[PDB]
Amino acid sequence: MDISKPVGSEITSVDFGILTAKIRNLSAKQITNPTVLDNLGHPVSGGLYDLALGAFLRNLCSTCGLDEKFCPGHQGHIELPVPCYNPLFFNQLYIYL
């Protein structure tokens, strides 16, 4: 904390809620390759260390274009083809079923 850097905005309240299946407007990474790495250590396109998900191993991120210490990281999504149920909310779907 530096006292020379004030912050004007602050959080009043937090709403809980459920992410709908329109992560498509959020996430344009689409992580589909189950292979993660290859020979000579470059992260594979589509794999779980995709460079659109943040900078990694002195590279630059494919989304924000910043290095390892300036990038926030970004959220990619795995398309499930079939609607597997949410295991938190199973006890309450089995009530309304």
Binding site: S4, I78, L88
Partner: protein, 284 residues
């Protein structure tokens, strides 16, 4: 519901996932070898089974056993995303010592996330040491060794009244006790005073009140990170903090030729402290 939304059925089924960013999934090494992250090991097992079913839907559509190969795959793509979030939900191998605790067990324990990294944290600018008796310090004071005194620093903003004291802290530098270790410029950039000598530090010390050419940061002034002096204060502590008099605001007296923190006898009943090798946490 002032947004007048609709309770939809898709809230209970996961059409997709999200994958946390790479910084939250960096490779979890141990010893002196790098290993793959745990949260990818049950997120690849989801992703091979989403690749098995992607081919077998094309196998059916170009025209049996193709349904028993498909319904058995739904047994495990449900169970792998079950094992991804919870871990006590999924049976799986059932040999014992289940790997990849999943995103619930990262939150629920005594440790979890919500009691080891939110309700309790680890702090900067703190020290701990064995305490030792002293009747020559005050009752509201602590005896700070010169080991801690040349480390714990305070960002003192330089002004017109402290410039006589903060020039000497830059000229003393990191070596002498009544000294500094860093100066912070008005652009936020630090200048360490460690590798310099007396002539670099005596030059800089005369530049603490020179205004910057930059106008976006004209409000600011510099900040000397002076060492901890005799006018600072300090929170002391002990390991069972059972009441609030086990954490109190001692003033600082820096005592030379000492290697332990040093405490008066009037505080020995408030911290429930006996001088037999107890350590006290010191917060600045």
């Amino acid at each position: 519901n002032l947004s007048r939304k609709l309770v939809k059925a898709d809230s209970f089924f996961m059409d997709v996932l999200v994958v946390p960013p790479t910084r939250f999934r960096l490779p979890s090494k141990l010893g002196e070898e790098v290993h793959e992250n745990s949260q990818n090991q049950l997120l690849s097992k989801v992703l091979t089974t989403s690749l098995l079913i992607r081919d077998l839907n094309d196998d059916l559509s170009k025209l049996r056993v193709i349904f028993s190969r498909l319904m058995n795959a739904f047994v495990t793509i449900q169970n792998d995303v079950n094992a991804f979030i919870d871990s006590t939900k999924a049976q799986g191998r059932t040999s014992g010592k289940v790997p990849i605790p999943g995103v619930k067990q990262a939150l629920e324990k005594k440790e979890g996330l919500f009691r080891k990294h939110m309700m309790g944290k680890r702090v900067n600018y703190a020290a701990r040491s064995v305490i030792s008796p002293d009747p020559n310090i005050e009752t509201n004071e602590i005896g700070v060794p010169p080991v801690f005194a040349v480390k714990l620093t305070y960002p003192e903003p330089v002004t017109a009244y402290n410039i006589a004291e903060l020039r000497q802290a830059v000229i003393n530098g990191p070596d002498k006790w009544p000294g500094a270790t860093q100066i912070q410029n008005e652009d936020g950039s630090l200048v360490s005073l460690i590798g310099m000598s007396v002539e670099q530090r005596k030059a800089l010390a005369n530049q603490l009140l020179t205004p910057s050419s930059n106008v976006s940061t004209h409000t600011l002034n510099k900040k000397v990170y002076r060492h901890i002096k005799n006018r600072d204060v300090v929170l002391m502590n002990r390991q069972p903090t059972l009441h609030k008099a086990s954490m109190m605001g001692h003033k600082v007296r820096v005592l030379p030729n000492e290697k332990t923190l040093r405490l008066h006898y009037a505080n020995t009943g408030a911290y429930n402290a006996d001088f037999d090798g107890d350590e006290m946490n010191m917060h600045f």
